[PDB]
Coordinates of all heavy atoms in Angstrom, one line a residue:
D137 N -32.5 -173.8 114.1 CA -31.1 -173.6 114.0 C -30.3 -174.8 114.5 O -29.2 -175.2 113.9 CB -30.6 -172.4 114.8 CG -29.2 -172.0 114.6 OD1 -28.8 -171.5 113.6 OD2 -28.4 -172.2 115.6
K138 N -30.7 -175.4 115.6 CA -30.1 -176.6 116.1 C -30.0 -177.7 115.0 O -28.9 -178.3 114.8 CB -30.8 -177.1 117.4 CG -30.5 -176.2 118.6 CD -31.3 -176.6 119.8 CE -30.7 -177.9 120.4 NZ -31.4 -178.3 121.6
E139 N -31.1 -178.0 114.4 CA -31.2 -179.0 113.4 C -30.1 -178.7 112.3 O -29.4 -179.6 111.9 CB -32.6 -179.0 112.7 CG -33.6 -179.8 113.5 CD -34.8 -180.1 112.7 OE1 -34.7 -180.4 111.5 OE2 -36.0 -180.0 113.2
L140 N -30.1 -177.4 111.8 CA -29.2 -177.0 110.7 C -27.7 -177.0 111.1 O -26.8 -177.1 110.3 CB -29.6 -175.7 110.2 CG -31.0 -175.8 109.4 CD1 -31.8 -174.5 109.5 CD2 -30.7 -176.2 107.9
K141 N -27.4 -176.8 112.4 CA -26.1 -176.8 113.0 C -25.6 -178.2 112.9 O -24.3 -178.4 112.9 CB -26.1 -176.3 114.4
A142 N -26.4 -179.2 112.8 CA -25.9 -180.6 112.6 C -25.4 -180.8 111.2 O -24.6 -181.7 111.0 CB -27.1 -181.6 112.8
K143 N -25.8 -179.9 110.2 CA -25.2 -180.0 108.9 C -24.2 -178.9 108.7 O -23.8 -178.5 107.6 CB -26.3 -179.8 107.8 CG -27.3 -180.9 107.7 CD -28.4 -180.6 106.6 CE -29.3 -181.7 106.5 NZ -30.4 -181.4 105.4
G144 N -23.7 -178.3 109.8 CA -22.7 -177.3 109.8 C -23.3 -176.0 109.2 O -22.5 -175.2 108.8
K145 N -24.6 -175.9 109.2 CA -25.3 -174.7 108.7 C -26.1 -174.0 109.8 O -26.1 -174.4 111.0 CB -26.2 -175.1 107.6 CG -25.6 -175.8 106.5 CD -26.5 -176.2 105.4 CE -25.8 -177.0 104.2 NZ -24.8 -176.2 103.6
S146 N -26.7 -172.8 109.5 CA -27.5 -172.1 110.5 C -28.9 -171.8 109.9 O -29.1 -172.0 108.6 CB -26.8 -170.7 110.9 OG -26.8 -169.8 109.8
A147 N -29.8 -171.4 110.8 CA -31.2 -171.2 110.3 C -31.4 -169.9 109.7 O -32.3 -169.8 108.8 CB -32.1 -171.4 111.6
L148 N -30.8 -168.8 110.2 CA -31.2 -167.4 109.8 C -30.1 -166.5 110.1 O -29.5 -166.3 111.2 CB -32.4 -167.0 110.6 CG -32.8 -165.5 110.6 CD1 -33.4 -165.1 109.2 CD2 -33.8 -165.2 111.6
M149 N -29.8 -165.7 109.0 CA -28.8 -164.6 109.1 C -29.3 -163.4 108.4 O -29.8 -163.5 107.2 CB -27.4 -165.1 108.6 CG -26.8 -166.2 109.3 SD -25.3 -166.8 108.6 CE -24.2 -165.4 108.9
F150 N -29.2 -162.3 109.1 CA -29.5 -161.0 108.4 C -28.7 -159.8 109.0 O -28.0 -160.0 110.1 CB -31.0 -160.7 108.5 CG -31.6 -160.5 109.9 CD1 -31.7 -159.2 110.4 CD2 -31.9 -161.6 110.7 CE1 -32.2 -159.1 111.7 CE2 -32.4 -161.4 112.0 CZ -32.5 -160.1 112.5
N151 N -28.8 -158.6 108.5 CA -28.0 -157.5 109.0 C -28.4 -157.1 110.3 O -29.6 -156.6 110.5 CB -28.0 -156.4 107.9 CG -27.0 -155.3 108.2 OD1 -26.2 -155.4 109.1 ND2 -27.1 -154.2 107.5
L152 N -27.5 -157.1 111.3 CA -27.8 -156.6 112.6 C -27.2 -155.3 112.9 O -27.3 -154.8 114.0 CB -27.3 -157.6 113.6 CG -27.8 -159.1 113.5 CD1 -27.1 -159.9 114.6 CD2 -29.2 -159.1 113.6
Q153 N -26.5 -154.7 111.9 CA -25.8 -153.5 112.1 C -26.8 -152.3 111.8 O -26.5 -151.2 112.0 CB -24.6 -153.4 111.2 CG -23.7 -154.6 111.4 CD -23.3 -154.9 112.8 OE1 -22.9 -154.0 113.6 NE2 -23.5 -156.2 113.2
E154 N -27.9 -152.7 111.1 CA -28.9 -151.6 110.7 C -30.2 -152.0 111.4 O -30.8 -153.1 111.0 CB -29.0 -151.6 109.2 CG -27.9 -150.8 108.6 CD -27.9 -149.3 109.0 OE1 -29.0 -148.8 109.3 OE2 -26.9 -148.7 108.9

Side-chain angles (χ1 to χ4, degrees), residues 137-140 142-154:
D137 183 73
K138 289 176 70 181
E139 286 195 35
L140 290 146
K143 292 181 179 178
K145 302 176 181 305
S146 67
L148 169 69
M149 298 177 66
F150 65 98
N151 189 5
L152 304 178
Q153 309 309 311
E154 282 295 335

